[PDB]
Amino acid sequence: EKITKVYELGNEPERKLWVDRYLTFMEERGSPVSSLPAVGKKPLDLFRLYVCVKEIGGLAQVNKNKKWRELATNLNVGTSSSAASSLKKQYIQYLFAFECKIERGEEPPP
Ligand SMILES: [Cl-]
Ligand SMILES: [Cl-]
Ligand SMILES: [Cl-]
Ligand SMILES: [Zn+2]
Ligand SMILES: [Zn+2]
Ligand SMILES: [Zn+2]
Ligand SMILES: [Zn+2]
């Protein structure tokens, strides 16, 4: 489905703003997101994924703590190691540049 779908994957107050802030960043770097990402067949909630990876401490920390399977489970995109590997790939492709830019202070945090 369309990326707009990510607005209804949750009820959080800050979802809409984070999403538009995120989509604006992707457009800015030349990689606009038009379709809602997915892990296999299941829809991927990029907002919740971003927030929880941030809770854990970022990509390197999720790797170190081997939390990809737990996150995939929490996001309902599979419980297998295959689902976990795919989720890590999607995080890298859709969110790591954003994590990196924000951490470096170039992009103010959402
Ligand atoms: Cl921006
Ligand atoms: Cl949360
Ligand atoms: Cl929380
Ligand atoms: Zn907006
Ligand atoms: Zn920007
Ligand atoms: Zn969390
Ligand atoms: Zn949380």
Curated annotation (Swiss-Prot):
It is found in: Nucleus. Disulfide bonds: none annotated. Coiled coil: none annotated. It is linked to Coffin-Siris syndrome 1: A form of Coffin-Siris syndrome, a congenital multiple malformation syndrome with broad phenotypic and genetic variability. Cardinal features are intellectual disability, coarse facial features, hypertrichosis, and hypoplastic or absent fifth digit nails or phalanges. Additional features include malformations of the cardiac, gastrointestinal, genitourinary, and/or central nervous systems. Sucking/feeding difficulties, poor growth, ophthalmologic abnormalities, hearing impairment, and spinal anomalies are common findings. Involved in transcriptional activation and repression of select genes by chromatin remodeling (alteration of DNA-nucleosome topology). Component of SWI/SNF chromatin remodeling complexes that carry out key enzymatic activities, changing chromatin structure by altering DNA-histone contacts within a nucleosome in an ATP-dependent manner. Belongs to the neural progenitors-specific chromatin remodeling complex (npBAF complex) and the neuron-specific chromatin remodeling complex (nBAF complex). Component of SWI/SNF chromatin remodeling complexes, in some of which it can be mutually exclusive with ARID1B/BAF250B. The canonical complex contains a catalytic subunit (either SMARCA4/BRG1/BAF190A or SMARCA2/BRM/BAF190B) and at least SMARCE1, ACTL6A/BAF53, SMARCC1/BAF155, SMARCC2/BAF170, and SMARCB1/SNF5/BAF47. Other subunits specific to each of the complexes may also be present permitting several possible combinations developmentally and tissue specific. This is AT-rich interactive domain-containing protein 1B.
